[PDB]
Amino acid sequence: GEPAVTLDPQQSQVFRAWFVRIAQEQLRQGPSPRWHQQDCAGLVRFAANEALKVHDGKWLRANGLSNRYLPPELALSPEQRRLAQNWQQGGGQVGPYVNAIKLVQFNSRLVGRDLNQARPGDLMFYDQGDDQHLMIWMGRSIAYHTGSSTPTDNGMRSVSLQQLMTWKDTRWIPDESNPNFIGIYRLAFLSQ
């Protein structure tokens, strides 16, 4: 009758390119009324939602992408464009917003613990005990949220794998030896 709404492999590749592009653009900015929550889950939901929008002139101007070599546009159904507005909440319940746990538990699948195998837009999931975090693998760098936004700072940061290995705070190392590094997850609506 009507299968489950997902992105095919080509669409998934273009979605990742838009996702990472939009994420990168958030680096040079202070709080946006456009994120649902001022945190990592907020950035992921925002970038995914914006990645699935029709990227018209008005959208390009609003997001400062007007004079750029951009990824291809997707020919998506309305249902596909609504994918980052309809997250699984558990028990078949659906909603427009997601925190880190609901995103990984109900809206992601494991890739593994080897960044060599990660694609741009894959999520690096950490459990520090009291608090769980998502970083975005951007392909050659990592976008993360400081955990503390202010009226002039959205808390978004970018670090190379190399510079992250220099951190005195060793809790964020994305390898086998880090018990706080849980894994690398792909958004469930992307193709394998």
Distance (Å, whole) CA 3 – CA 136 = 29
CA quadruple 137, 118, 97, 150: dihedral, nearest 10? -10
Distance (Å, whole) CA 135 – CA 145 = 7
Cβ partners under 8 Å of residue 75, min gap 6: none
Question: Which secondary structure element, helix H or strand E, spans residue 21, and what is its range?
Answer: helix 9-25
User: Which DSSP string do the residues of 121-155 spell out, in sequence order?
Assistant: T-EEEEE-SS-EEEEEE-SSSEEEE-S--BTTB--
DSSP-derived secondary structure letter, 184: E
* Experimental structure resolution, Å: 1.7
The SS3 call for residue 161 is helix
Long-range contacts of 144-149 (CB under 8 A, 24+ apart): 144/40, 144/172, 145/39, 145/40, 145/42, 145/43, 147/39, 149/31, 149/38, 149/39
User: Which DSSP string do the residues of 43-104 spell out, in sequence order?
Assistant: HHHHHHHHHTS---HHHHHHTT-TTS--PPPP---HHHHTGGG-EEEETTEEES---HHHHH
Adjacent-strand bridge partners of 151? none
